[model samples]
Target: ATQRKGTDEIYGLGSLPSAGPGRWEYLANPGNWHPERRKLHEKLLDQARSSALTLAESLESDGCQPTLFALRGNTATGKTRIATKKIPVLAAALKKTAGKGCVNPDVFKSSLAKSETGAKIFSSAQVHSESSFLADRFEGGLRSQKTGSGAIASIVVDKRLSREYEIDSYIQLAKETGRKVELCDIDAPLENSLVGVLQRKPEGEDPRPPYPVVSSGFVAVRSNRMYVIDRFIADPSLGNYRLFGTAEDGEKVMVASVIGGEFSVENAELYEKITSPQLSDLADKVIDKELIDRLENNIADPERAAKTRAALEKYSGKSWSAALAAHSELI
Candidate 1:
């Protein structure tokens, strides 16, 4: 009963508009890959590849080794906002067209006006509050140098790195694929992220209030993402790893970086210049604790010591439990 409402409430990209089995919500079903939905995803995906290749073959044999500039972080840790700012800057530095994000609002509106499904979906009551699916557009920009013709594009690939074997597979590919991995570690406290989701504005037309509990659930394992990042950095074969920290007013700064496998004396000094403080004391339920402490506390005093103590009785949906399980299993 709750799952039906949550899916409907959770803002997402274009998908089958109607509600489904009490257990399933097709509206936010990017992870639920059925044929029709998968086909739609593939269409945008193909466009990303074609554009990357078109630019690649014209520029020279290509990554752009196209460089996969992947930003790894927990949900609501400013991944999209940071990427939106960085994509254009990185593309200019590399002299490549920014391939991330959908076209601008004017162009976007025109295309959808001519597009039947696009208009219908946007016209619906469920506004697309947040969409990684559109971000999926430039994903093709991530690869396409198979011929050794050479680097294709500088694409921003934002990831939560939460699923089982997610970072592991990327590691294998990075080691083998000859792609330059510009790994960005978006560092922030878990609680700030909780506040981020709670306060994020709904971009689409719906004035409906956003859901913190649902969004906060995603932060269940931010620490786990940090764990995988440490593992990712130990790999010396990769090129750059920049740690971006968040400031009080929500500005992001590159606190530390090891570019081209060198954390130069200059960089060490740059890191030491340190600038950014915490957005302390935020949110409904915070899950930061020693594992033993969390485990024992949750079961022992069992909510007594918790903002978590009154967590409502809820049967997490099928896709729901699997989501967290996949996150917990990332290591």
Candidate 2:
């Protein structure tokens, strides 16, 4: 019997072919989706395209030639805010100048939950995205040196943290191809991302799936991500990093940066960092007293508040400690 191709062969990001018949059928017939959900998905892809296009334009205007621009952060580290916030000013600027240009983690995760077969079919997607996305997503192809047009003229591709957890391959690939790579690092700590898990409204208002606010899933993810991010930061030669953080005003601003010719001290550092009581404040730079007020507003009832805090305490306590100790220990 001939071997049947599934997994990575089913669908891929960047240059990988869109999707196989089975997966396509699943995604195409959103008969299972609510009407608003369809609009939400379409909105997500559109926002991703335009925002990415706008970002490239902004980069070019900044006197930098960027072939690939990627976002870095663990889950809920404010990366999705780029898409959620939209870019009207940039879109207008593009209309006055040239043109247009997407990752919806919520959309992908929710889609995967729909079908048992679809889940397995799309499983290979992560490996494919990590390795093959750079070339297919950005390389447009070329014409010549003096006047020849550059690689293919453009489609905006964005990576999701849920998959493609590693960044080095993309960095290496961009360099080898004569492309300059730039990364937008969402600089926040594990505690802050956990705050996202707490703050994210469910799939109704947003495409984001409701994370069980008190689960170990995020704990393990936070650990593995720290493991990867630590390696990237500590490297001595891996340059082109720009870190973005939220200020006291809740606005995003550049916080820290370095060029990577250089950068991991991840697991140990995370283990060490997790034990601190002020992770949220340290990560986001909030006053410690304000966090108490912040939680008070989110959890109004005292009973609910107690249970939630216990859960969070457990998460920040042994859960993260255990998770950091075992980086690849997927929950």
Candidate 3:
């Protein structure tokens, strides 16, 4: 009889090996994907490779090698999906261009599993760590002074709001390891993100935790901002940082009422600050008001307008931008 692996027996991000066979088969290989999706996927792959090579050349000029490309964003902004899409794209780029002694996946696997931070991160029972594990392998690796070079050229990390402070620290550390860091920001409107949080469900037989708990945590993170998102958005030296808004798709878009719920007193401080008139002008300062304007424009339906106002009434006098600005942090 074949014994199945326990949930704890599995490590890294999700149930699959980090950039291993399954991802290679599904995401990297063109023949395995649906025909309709294949062209776009291939296009993104080419873009990813071209961008990576350009980054590599830039790094070489600086006497550095390829290292990390992190996607920074609020929760539910589709960072994981984008990272998954890019994994094979970057992998293909590295294979063709990196010098012979650099493509070592084993070094990556061991570094992820054995390092102090990696060990602590992987010992958890939650499923999000699977993506974290995956990001570490494909996005970047920790090269000890005594160890040899590895095969990874560029890796992707999806940084949460709470852990954003660590990004500066990681960048300083990566500099010491002779690698350059690329940054991208994923932006999803609060309405869509709230809906995404509420709509998440478990896959069949998956032991992942209830998503509402996770969703609320995301809400907590995205709903408070002390610094500025515009700071990062304006920095030209931040290295290929792109903002991706996840709320709309061509004509289809999410509405404001998606966040129609009570604001908990536990988060009263955040609510007070966000809803304050002193920061009301700061509303349009962070996220573009166009997303909320679209939400308001949809209110031409009357009933939806009533519903939208009802939702807005719940947040004192704060608009969608207020809620969004509350969550946009720079630290």
Candidate 4:
């Protein structure tokens, strides 16, 4: 059932109106009913029904399998306003990636092209999506954080860490690790590390979406590992990480996300080098030789037994020599 828009105010209307006029009072006598008020009420109800129908139709088209969510918050808390902004962005992203064999489709196709190399991009996407299962939608495609399935990953960060001695720990680790760090590095920390930051807020106007210029950092580990990290101001994720918030400032906020590692910066470097259009003639040489032939075989026969061979090319986005050549030029 929907929360009545005026429930809070109605429950508290005994006070004086801010206007010079006295607080409006409902007449107790049954005979005092106004025809106009009844008509207006009925119209509003009808409008609500119409809107629900329209929303349902749209979800049906996308096959997004939307669910209903009932959000509860006090006035000026930006609940509906936040919902208007975030739900659709996330839903669109999910729908585009959720279809069968669709998550990172390009990568999936590449792995399929090689028999020895199997692709697991779809599996990764499944893991990513599964993390949000707990935040499933209700009948109306709305998801609430309070209760839902368990597919979403919950991230909690403390703003105070930036000002506390705690931030120093991060800086120290970066230096000790011989890592390059920047403001935008925040997103990668929480994302990659096995251990996460403790929760709390810092003193300041911490905002969401994060400043593009915010501190970001990275480290090159091993020949194939690279890390990227950053932080975001976040709204409450009503389970499954599906959040409600306006594009503008939201009410409740949290420190969200810090990613780490690109899995050996060398991997990225090599990927960049081989994918370069000017170097298209040399992609196979640049790619991991041990992986190429195996990947080709996986493409021919994509059974689970060939997982190791498939995973590389599946995530690699390199299908055939010529197709890789074409993509190499674009990159």
Model 3 error, position 217 (Å): 4.8
User: At residue 54, what lDDT does model 1 achieve?
Assistant: 46
Task: Give the Cα lDDT of each candidate.
Answer: 0.43, 0.40, 0.38, 0.26
**Stretches of candidate 1 exceeding 4 Å from the true structure:** 1-42, 51-64, 80-89, 93-115, 118-155, 162-164, 189-221, 225-229, 263-331
Where is model 4 poorest over a 10-residue stretch in terms of lDDT? 192-201
After best superposition, candidate 4 residue 215: deviation in angstroms? 33
- Structural RMSD, model 1: 12.9
Error of 1 at 200 (Å): 5.1
- TM-score of model number 3: 0.37
What TM-score does each of the candidates earn? 0.49, 0.42, 0.37, 0.22
Better of 1 and 2 by lDDT: 1
lDDT of 1 at 44: 53
lDDT of 4 by residue, 73-111 (tens): 112233323444445633343343232111111222222
Q: Point out the higher-scoring one by TM-score: 1 or 2.
A: 1
* Highest TM-score model number: 1
Name the lDDT value of residue 143 in candidate 3.
Answer: 38
Candidate 3 lDDT over residue span 1-331, tens digit each: 0232322123212344344455543334445444543443344335444444444544344444455565555555566555545444444444454421222222122222223243422312332333233333333323332212343334334445334456556566556665555554444544545433322322211112223433444444444322323333444333433333342341222111101121113233433433212312322332234544565664455654555544344443444345333222110
| Rank list by TM-score | 1, 2, 3, 4
- Total clashing pairs for each candidate: 15, 25, 13, 96
Candidate 1 lDDT over residue span 1-331, tens digit each = 2232221233334444553342244433555554544455456556555554444443333313445566676666666556657554454333443442322112122222223253323321122212233333344235444433444443345556654376667666566656667666675555445334323323432122223332342453343444454554466566676667665444577766666556533334334332222223233332333422443342333333232222211112213223223332221
Models, CA RMSD each:
12.9, 11.9, 16.3, 22.8
Model 3, stretches more than 4 Å misplaced? Answer: 1-65, 80-141, 144-152, 159-161, 197-201, 204-238, 246-331
